[PDB]
Amino acid sequence: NREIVMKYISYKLSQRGYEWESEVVHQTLRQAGDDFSLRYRRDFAEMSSQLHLTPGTAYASFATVVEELFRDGVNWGRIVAFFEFGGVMCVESVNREMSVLVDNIAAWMATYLNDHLHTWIQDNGGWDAFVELYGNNAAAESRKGQ
Numbered sequence: 001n002r003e004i005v006m007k008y009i010s011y012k013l014s015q016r017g018y019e020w021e022s023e024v025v026h027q028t029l030r031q032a033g034d035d036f037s038l039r040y041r042r043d044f045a046e047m048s049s050q051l052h053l054t055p056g057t058a059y060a061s062f063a064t065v066v067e068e069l070f071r072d073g074v075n076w077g078r079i080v081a082f083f084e085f086g087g088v089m090c091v092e093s094v095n096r097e098m099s100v101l102v103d104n105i106a107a108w109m110a111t112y113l114n115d116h117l118h119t120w121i122q123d124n125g126g127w128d129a130f131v132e133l134y135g136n137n138a139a140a141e142s143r144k145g146q
């Protein structure tokens with residue numbers, strides 16, 4: 001998926017004011033990402049406090065985090081974490097006057113989605129099943145998985 005990436009990044013860049021599947025998939029993913037960033041605010045803040053970003057290290061940083069994220073397997077919340085992480089990297093790139101990196105990060109994200117998440121997503125009911133899970137309350141999400 002690639003539109004999904006560009007629409008996400010464009011939105012995260014907006015929440016900081018900086019200009020760069022059905023609509024309900026894109027809205028739900030935005031909403032789930034915002035949820036993630038609130039619930040894991042310490043990790044978001046730690047990441048910001050400890051991210052050391054240059055164009056020369058940007059790929060290593062991107063690839064290292066993503067590899068740790070999915071090391072024990074894929075699930076929908078880690079896919080949300082993936083989008084949020086890339087969005088933050090793009091935000092931090094623009095903040096540090098390295099805006100060149102945004103297109104690179106978008107490409108890396110789209111490539112990771114296509115090459116390493118597409119199979120899992122298809123096998124787990126597609127983005128339609130993501131939206132279904134988001135709608136269900138915590139108790140109902142555990143029941144559906146079980």
Ligand SMILES: COc1cc2c(cc1[C@H](CN1CCCC1)c1ccc(-c3ccc(C(=O)NS(=O)(=O)c4ccc(N[C@H](CCN5CCOCC5)CSc5ccccc5)c(S(=O)(=O)C(F)(F)F)c4)cc3)cc1)OCO2
Pocket residue numbers: 032033035036040043044047065068069075076077078080081084085130131133134135136137138141
């Ligand atoms: C390297 O790891 C990273 C990378 C990071 C990062 C944080 C991490 C850390 C690593 N830390 C730091 C060092 C090692 C430990 C991290 C890595 C992973 C996670 C994590 C935490 C929880 C889950 C998890 O619950 N996944 S889950 O079961 O599939 C799930 C549960 C609830 C939900 N949605 C629920 C929606 C509730 N609805 C209920 C009814 O009305 C509307 C809302 C709960 S909201 C939520 C959103 C995202 C993630 C977790 C909870 C979802 S979802 O929103 O994706 C949906 F499918 F529903 F659409 C998935 C998955 C991953 C948390 C933190 O920040 C961005 O970059």
